[PDB]
Amino acid sequence: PIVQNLQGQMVHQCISPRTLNAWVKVVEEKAFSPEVIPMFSALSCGATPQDLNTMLNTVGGHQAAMQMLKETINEEAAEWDRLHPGQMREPRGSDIAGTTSTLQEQIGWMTHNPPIPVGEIYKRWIILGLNKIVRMYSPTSILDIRQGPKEPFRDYVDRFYKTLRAEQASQNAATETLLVQNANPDCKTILKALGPGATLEEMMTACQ
Amino acid sequence: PIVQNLQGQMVHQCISPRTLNAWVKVVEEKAFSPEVIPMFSALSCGATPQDLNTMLNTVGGHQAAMQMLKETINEEAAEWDRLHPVGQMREPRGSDIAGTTSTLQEQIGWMTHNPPIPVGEIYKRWIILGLNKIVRMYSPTSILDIRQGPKEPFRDYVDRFYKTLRAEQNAATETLLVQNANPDCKTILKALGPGATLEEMMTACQG
Amino acid sequence: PIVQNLQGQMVHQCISPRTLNAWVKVVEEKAFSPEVIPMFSALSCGATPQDLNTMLNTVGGHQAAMQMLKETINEEAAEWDRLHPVMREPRGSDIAGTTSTLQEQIGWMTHNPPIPVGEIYKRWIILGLNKIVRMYSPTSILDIRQGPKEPFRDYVDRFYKTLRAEQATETLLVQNANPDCKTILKALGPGATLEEMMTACQ
Amino acid sequence: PIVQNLQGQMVHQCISPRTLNAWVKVVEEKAFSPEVIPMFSALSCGATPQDLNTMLNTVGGHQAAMQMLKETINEEAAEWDRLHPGPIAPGQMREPRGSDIAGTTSTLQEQIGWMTHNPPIPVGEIYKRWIILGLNKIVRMYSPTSILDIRQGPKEPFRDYVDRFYKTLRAEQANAATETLLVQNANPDCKTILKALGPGATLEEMMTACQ
Amino acid sequence: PIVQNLQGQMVHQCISPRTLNAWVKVVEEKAFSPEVIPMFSALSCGATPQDLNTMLNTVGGHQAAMQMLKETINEEAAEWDRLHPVHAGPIAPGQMREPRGSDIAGTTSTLQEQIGWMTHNPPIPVGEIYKRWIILGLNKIVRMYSPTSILDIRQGPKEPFRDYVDRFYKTLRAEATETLLVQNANPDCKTILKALGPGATLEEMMTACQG
Amino acid sequence: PIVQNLQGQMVHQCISPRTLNAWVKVVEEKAFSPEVIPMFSALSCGATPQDLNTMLNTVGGHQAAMQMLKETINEEAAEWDRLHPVHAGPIAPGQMREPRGSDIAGTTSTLQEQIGWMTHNPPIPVGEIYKRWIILGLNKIVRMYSPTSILDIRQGPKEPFRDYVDRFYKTLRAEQASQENAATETLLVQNANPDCKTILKALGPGATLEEMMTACQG
Ligand SMILES: CN(C(=O)[C@H](Cc1cccnc1)NC(=O)Cn1nc(C(F)(F)F)c2c1CCCC2)c1ccccc1
Ligand SMILES: CN(C(=O)[C@H](Cc1cccnc1)NC(=O)Cn1nc(C(F)(F)F)c2c1CCCC2)c1ccccc1
Ligand SMILES: CN(C(=O)[C@H](Cc1cccnc1)NC(=O)Cn1nc(C(F)(F)F)c2c1CCCC2)c1ccccc1
Ligand SMILES: CN(C(=O)[C@H](Cc1cccnc1)NC(=O)Cn1nc(C(F)(F)F)c2c1CCCC2)c1ccccc1
Ligand SMILES: CN(C(=O)[C@H](Cc1cccnc1)NC(=O)Cn1nc(C(F)(F)F)c2c1CCCC2)c1ccccc1
Ligand SMILES: CN(C(=O)[C@H](Cc1cccnc1)NC(=O)Cn1nc(C(F)(F)F)c2c1CCCC2)c1ccccc1
Secondary structure, three states, rough: EEEEEEOOOOEOOOOOOHHHHHHHHHHHHOOOOOOOOHHHHHHHOOOOOOHOOOOOOHOOOOOHHHHHHHHHHHHHHHHHHOOOOOOOOOHHHHHHHHOOOOHHHHHHHHOOOOOOOOOHHHHHHHHHHHHHHHHOOOOOOHHHOOOOOOOHHHHHHHHHHHHHHOOOOOOOHHHHHHHHHOOOHHHHHHHHHOOOOOOHHHHHOOOO | EEEOOOOEEEEEOOOOOHHHHHHHEEEEEEHOOOOHOOOOOOHOOOOOOHHHHHHHHOOOOOOHHHHHHHHHHHHHHHHHHHHOOOOOOOOOOOOHOOOOOHHHHHHHHOOOOOOOOOHHHHHHHHHHHHHHHHHOOOOOOOOOHHHOOOOOOOOHHHHHHHHHHHOOOOOOHHHHHOOOHHHHHHOOOOOOOOOOOOOHHHOOOOO | OOOEEOOEEEEEEOOOOHHHHHHHHHHHOOOOOOOHHHHHHOOOOOOHHHHHHHHHHHOOOOHHHHHHHHHHHHHHHHHHHOOOOOOOOOOOHHHOOOOOOOOHEEEEEEOOOOOHHHHHHHHHHHHHHHHHHHHHOOOOHHHHHOOOOOOOHHHHHHHHHHHHHHHOHHHHHOOOOOHHHHHHHHHHOOOOOOHHHHHOOO | OOEEOOOOOEEEEEHHHHHHHHHHHHHHOOOOOOOHHHHHHOOOOOOHHHHHHHHHHOOOOOHHHHHHHHHHHHHHHHHHHHOOOOOOOOOOOOOOOHHHHHOOOOOOHHHHHHHHHHOOOOHHHHHHHHHHHHHHHHHHHHHOOOOHHHOOOOOOOOOHHHHHHHHHHHHHOOOOHHHHHHHHHOHHHHHHHHHHHHHOOOOOHHHHOOO | EEEEOOOOOOOOOOOOOOHHHHHHHHHHHHHHOOOOOHHHHHHHHOOOHHHHHHHHHHHOOOOHHHHHEEEEEEEHHHHHHOOOOOOOOOOOOOOOOOOHHHOOOOOOOOHHHHHHHHHOOOOHHHHHHHHHHHHHHHHHHHHHOOOOOOOOOOOOOOOOOHHHHHHHHHHHHHHOOOHHOOOOOOOHHHHHHHHHHHOOOHHHHHOOOOO | EEEEEEOOEEEEEOHHHHHHHHHHHHHHHOOOOOHHHHHHHHOOOOOOHHHHHHHHHHOOOOOOHHHOOOOHHHHHHHHHHHOOOOOOOOOOOOOOOOHHHHHHHHOOOOOEEEHHHHHOOOOHHHHHHHHHHHHHHHHHHHHHHOOOOOOOOOOOOOOOOHHHHHHHHHHHHOOOOOOOOOOHHHHHHHOHHHHHHHHHHHOOOOHHHHHHHHHOOO
16 A cells, blocks of 8 residues: 655555455455445555455455456456556556556556556446445345334334445435335334424334 | 644544454444444544545444434534535535545545644534434433332442433433332432432442 | 653544453453452553543443442542632543543643643542442451361452452451461461461461 | 665564464465465565565465475576576675575575665565465365366356356466356356357346346 | 653653553463463563552452562562662752652652653663562462472373473472482383483483383 | 664564464464474564563473473583683673673573674674574474374375375474475375375376376375
8 A cells, every 4th residue: 555654755565464354354254245345445545556456366255246346347447448548658447457567657656746546546446346246246126125014113224224225336215205115004104194204213213 | 534643744544444343343242322422433533524434334234323324414414504604715515524525635635724624523523413313212211211120239220220311311310210219229218318429329229 | 642752742642442442341341340440540541531531431331330430520520629719720620521622631731830630530530430349349358257168368369359349457367267277377476477377277 | 574664764574473373374264265375475565585484384284285385486496597597796795596585595684685775686576476376386286176167056046156167267277268168057047048148248247147 | 661762762651451451361361370470571571660560450369369479579678678778868950869669669659750760871770670579479479379399290100201291390380400300200211211321311311211 | 672663773672462472372272383483483583582581481381392492502502602602801892791602591691781782783693593592492392292203104095195295294394393305205105095106106207296296186
């Protein structure tokens, strides 16, 4: 990663072993749950393209999803070439992904004046691929999330928005109407009686 | 977060994996017990709005509470815009404090300006308000229904009493504490008279 | 907390997640054994009143004891005001961190001469923890007697473990030994060291 | 490892107990799965030849693979002695031979010097390259199955089959050919649907077309 | 403790949670085995008298031993007052008041006074002096906790010679003695050993009775 | 230990609780396996003689082995005294007295003296000299705790060849003090099981270990 000293200069540092282990443990314990993407973005703060490849390469299984991620990176690299086809040489799509660029060249673009943040650009592509993976690996559709007859309303809302976050790539009024439609008859009657425009706080209080 | 370097300047620093891991474990273990809010306020010391969004986004379960927290954040941002209508520095909107329409460099520019506009501390106040609602929501019992069992030691009844009172939130609470004790200890408490401290009440009912 | 820099400067730092977790685990594992108090004193080294409230607020259970601690703080704060009647000097609530900002707390601790509001508050907290440790001690020192088949060292272990939670004592130790060892202790004479008393009744 | 102090100078540092325990646990828990190589290169970031020998020596199991690694290291050392075959000028350093890069006949002070020289000589990065070439061979040999024998079971979800496919492919390569193999060894049910999608299908499309 | 900063000055530092938990854990797991004394000495590196009292006060249980240690500290503090009597009168400018035994033990001295002695030029190491008093008391605790003396250990006729030497030097650490190990062996190994006779290294002894 | 300050100054640091606990655990879990020795050397990087004595003194059990290590240290110290006798007289200003064997072992030298030696210009590395003496004694311990001879490592009738080679070079490493021959690989072929030994002989002489293990993968 590229960080700055206690004095105040941008320097390259080796990826910490604690960061490497934290990322491996997240994939092993959470698979591709939606919260894996914000964890990846945080653990790769200031990462070079080389660091991002290191993090992706330490992932054990899930190689079908990883190949899909590599294909997404290939698409974004080709689109970058179409949008960008004494003067400094500017990076190609393969330079941002780190397949045709050295660490020295990556540091050059990132600490140039003005800078080309090849690390941030690459991270954008990776997060795009990770979003496509989370959506596909979502077990259930949001339309199949229905409150059981003996399931508390709070536990039902937990499954609802957990599913919604995986399908929307963590990114409305149709959601609220679906949450009410798929509540059990007793709770739905109460929710209907609350009048439109009720907050989630008022809905969960009314169905306690 | 924004920390201090060895030149007196406030510099930006990546959020550490130990801080991220600590906050995730706190939610997994304590759920929304009252002590989760001082833990969040301390782990987010010096956090930017981006760092605050990172911490909330790494919470996997309890998405009903996190959605409730997002609605609280939206309500506080709209109220901020109402109280702040449109070489002068541009001031942040509610969506800038929440980090939805502001870049990291803009957030750093506000927090390190002279004088500073602490968008990180303002956002943290909106989050803590939402967490207060969640903790009160997850409180399994109202304070009025906390009653000492006929065989329950007085110390264990007081533990439940003040844990509940803290989750919901004084002469009214002392009245309720003595009123809801079992008949045995209740007569020993009323026999003490007014001005009895909790230490005195727990000693008189230790048997 | 306010700590020495690497460049010889007293600066304010965020409280460590390591330190917070250590204080939480101590209360969970040890409840209110006597050794909780020296652990709290070391973990709050250099702490502001804000940091001290943060530590106390992370305690999840034992809210009966924490309420007792809260009432002890209020009695110490009210006594501070009576002993300091009206450079603005801090009131009792300023030391307790209820009416003072972090910037005012730093303004007192790093003044020349300093008003150590963090050290004063920690003293009030430790006085409150002393009362909790005493109240949560199961047995009085007078009820500690040596069993007929209990080795002397095991009886001394329980005697001073109880005495630490409570707080002469030498008289009680010999008086409450079993009739056998009690004879050998008085046979050695007065002013015998504990080592000499434990080797005689081994 | 050779890091940099605040005075912009490259200083030598002791290997952390964290990095040591990490590399040991990596080999103990993951054996020689393909992800161990990038974990070694990252844990050996900025390492001297001595640091690399220390990490390899803390591995106590799999001594058969470690001996193979030694044999690969000796081959690459003899190669270097050929493509890079005496009074040393003041301020300069001796030319490194293959045994010097591997740390057998070199000293830490010489290693620090080469890696800090104003004309830099990265003996550690050259040694790491030789080690990774050897680890590539170990990963290939420890692959229990060949790519040509990866076949989708009758009730095996396509997702699990592609997982085993590309895990094997990554261990052997330590491309239409792989795709044609992927569609061929899919169970007859999925194979038909995949042939129907036509050519030039993305893995994302083939997987949602075989859920 | 007292550590050196980036300006070559000895400054005070808060005792770390890792240091506290480590000392508590070694007492919980090892009681007062002889190895707890070098562990105490290493974990108390740079400690002030205040730090040493914190470490002793966090010890749970074993309060009879802690009481003996407390009495040993009082004896050494009284001996210090006898050998270093404090002189009355005003204290020279830029100088520290002379520490008595209670100052070294940390009962009557402030933290600022302890730092003043430990960082003075020349320094009065009240932390090192106090730690010697503590280690002396811990040695007396290790002895009273030792179950068996170095004489009441003998090699079982079926016990291997290595296992016997393990119990030998273990009980010796708790309590020219290498001339008794041969004597208190089993009749078999003894014979073989005496055949080697003099100048016998322990390595030679264990080799002679390997089977 | 003695490390480089961020300001480029060789200064003394206390040994860390992380390092102290790591060494104790290694001996508790791995005993005296060959990989313990490089772990000791890595955890004692930059250590003074006082630190090295601390690490050895915190070891629980194995006191027969630790006594043998102690005697090995005495032999190396006596050899140091015979090769570097201390010249009598006063020590020149700004100089350190000449260390004897007991000073390198940290028995008759203070921490301040050890620091003066290790940071002198040029330095006398009393920590590195002592660590060599410790690794020598640790080599004898590794061989003692590993009694199985390499001549007695034979592949089981149904044992996979890879597991047999694992045991072979693990045993060889313990006997050789991790010091790196045809006779090694020929013994490996000689003591394989009939099925594998045939294939190995069918490969021809002078095969590499990679070729041998690939041939017996079945
Ligand atoms: C920029 N920003 C974010 O990043 C937020 C941060 C955040 C705030 C509160 C709770 N938790 C996370 N993150 C999310 O809103 C992710 N998220 N997305 C969904 C989905 F819509 F997909 F269902 C859900 C969730 C979360 C739990 C409900 C379902 C943000 C910040 C302030 C207001 C608005 C947005
Ligand atoms: C600013 N300050 C705080 O932050 C304190 C710090 C503190 C002090 C003692 C024990 N533990 C925490 N924290 C609290 O008083 C939280 N608290 N709140 C309740 C409630 F009444 F709501 F139920 C309870 C509790 C906790 C003990 C049971 C009931 C504070 C400081 C000194 C005096 C007054 C306030
Ligand atoms: C300032 N100082 C302290 O802090 C000491 C440090 C210490 C010393 C030895 C063992 N362990 C802790 N700590 C204590 O004396 C706590 N203590 N208190 C009791 C009590 F009598 F109250 F029951 C007991 C104990 C502990 C052993 C059983 C009975 C101190 C230092 C040197 C001499 C005098 C005081
Ligand atoms: C330089 N670079 C790398 O280092 C990448 C980084 C990466 C990217 C996406 C997912 N995971 C890791 N790593 C790999 O491509 C390893 N890899 N190799 C294979 C194999 F070809 F052997 F089958 C497979 C895999 C992994 C997924 C199954 C099959 C790289 C970066 C961007 C595009 C292209 C290459
Ligand atoms: C200053 N120095 C020490 O500190 C040594 C360090 C050390 C060296 C080798 C093994 N382990 C520890 N430590 C000891 O010699 C403690 N020791 N004491 C005994 C006893 F005789 F009491 F039983 C034994 C032991 C150790 C295991 C056998 C029986 C020291 C250093 C070099 C040579 C001489 C002394
Ligand atoms: C200086 N250097 C070393 O330090 C090496 C480093 C290393 C390299 C690869 C794998 N693992 C460790 N270490 C060893 O060769 C220890 N070693 N010794 C043996 C023995 F022959 F004794 F059986 C074995 C082993 C290891 C596993 C097989 C049997 C070294 C470096 C490059 C080439 C030559 C030597």
